[PDB]
Amino acid sequence: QPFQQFGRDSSDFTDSVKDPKTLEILDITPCSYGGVSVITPGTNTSDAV
Amino acid sequence: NSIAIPTNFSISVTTEVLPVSMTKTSVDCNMYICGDSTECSSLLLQYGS
Numbered sequence: 678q679p680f681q682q683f684g685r686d687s688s689d690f691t692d693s694v695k696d697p698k699t700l701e702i703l704d705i706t707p708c709s710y711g712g713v714s715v716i717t718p719g720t721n722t723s724d725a726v
Numbered sequence: 727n728s729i730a731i732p733t734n735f736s737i738s739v740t741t742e743v744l745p746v747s748m749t750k751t752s753v754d755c756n757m758y759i760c761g762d763s764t765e766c767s768s769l770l771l772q773y774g775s
């Protein structure tokens with residue numbers, strides 16, 4: 678709806694915003710989303726992971 | 727002086743349910759707290775372990 682400048686959320690985390698120059702809505706997503714796991718065989722064993 | 731003795735039998739099948747396990751979860755502090763903020767990350771590091 679009009680008269681809106683920010684996009685809120687249930688957790689009060691911004692996700693959308695209106696560009697004041699192009700008058701169109703954008704989207705915000707954190708640079709890191711997924712989870713990363715690393716498997717190692719031990720320090721003495723080797724260093725490859 | 728009396729006694730009761732059964733003369734017939736029946737076969738019955740019953741069910742029983744027992745939980746064995748639940749879901750597994752993980753939590754990241756640097757993302758749940760101080761989401762995308764270098765100053766807040768430094769403050770959290772200063773806070774302690």
Ligand SMILES: *[C@@H]1O[C@H](CO)[C@@H](O[C@@H]2O[C@H](CO)[C@@H](O[C@@H]3O[C@H](CO)[C@@H](O)[C@H](O)[C@@H]3O)[C@H](O)[C@H]2NC(C)=O)[C@H](O)[C@H]1NC(C)=O
Nearest residue numbers: 678679680681682683694695696697698699700701702703
């Ligand atoms: C400053 O904000 C104003 C509104 O207050 C914006 O005005 C818009 O200016 C742009 C400049 O690119 C105009 O787009 C142009 O329109 C025609 C389409 O045929 C053409 O000349 C270009 O291809 C371009 O797309 C736009 O029409 C205009 N809006 C109006 C007149 O209602 C403006 O975006 C901002 N000024 C800047 C970025 O310099």
Ligand SMILES: *[C@@H]1O[C@H](CO)[C@@H](O[C@@H]2O[C@H](CO)[C@@H](O[C@@H]3O[C@H](CO)[C@@H](O)[C@H](O)[C@@H]3O)[C@H](O)[C@H]2NC(C)=O)[C@H](O)[C@H]1NC(C)=O
Nearest residue numbers: 727728729730731732733734735736737738739740741742
């Ligand atoms: C006490 O136990 C006796 C066996 O030691 C049971 O007698 C027999 O029970 C079977 C159960 O399948 C009866 O079969 C059924 O009979 C009729 C035939 O028209 C029909 O309902 C079914 O198609 C099936 O074949 C069998 O007739 C029966 N025999 C007699 C002589 O009654 C007896 O049922 C047990 N008592 C109770 C209260 O369950």
Ligand SMILES: *[C@@H]1O[C@H](CO)[C@@H](O)[C@H](O)[C@H]1NC(C)=O
Nearest residue numbers: 717718719720721722723724
């Ligand atoms: C790693 O290897 C060395 C090689 O002698 C051994 O003495 C040491 O106990 C090992 N370290 C661990 C933590 O197992």
